[PDB]
């Protein structure tokens, strides 16, 4: 159902190329966020409040299989890594992940460790 990434109250921070940051949540899979060569390419969503998070899609437009992890937090200091695909070699257009029942968080952080990362969209579904 509802895509929290596109809620007005949701803010987004990126480790590079801030000019393209809103491309992560504009509802258009072909508008991309393409990070530069920083060692830790990362995106953090602040949902503004602690919310139910049921599922997450990452639309990956680059050539290489995406290597990534997903972390969540309530206070923004203590993080729980809920998906760890840093060694992934599977090549998919969309990397979907369904969360355990009852997962909540205010912050959702995405770390990308592959090459040619180009993210068309990140969708964070509440139930
Ligand atoms: Ca987009």
Residue numbers in the entry: 1495 to 1621
Show the paper's wording.
CBMs are presently classified into over 60 amino acid sequenced based families; the CBMs from CpGH89 all belong to CBM family 32, which is one of the most diverse CBM families. Thus, CpGH89 possesses a complex multimodular architecture where the composite modules function together to efficiently act on components of mucin.
Overall, the presence of at least three functional CBMs in CpGH89, with a fourth likely, imparts diversity in the ability of this enzyme to recognize carbohydrate substructures and potential for increased affinity through multivalent interactions.
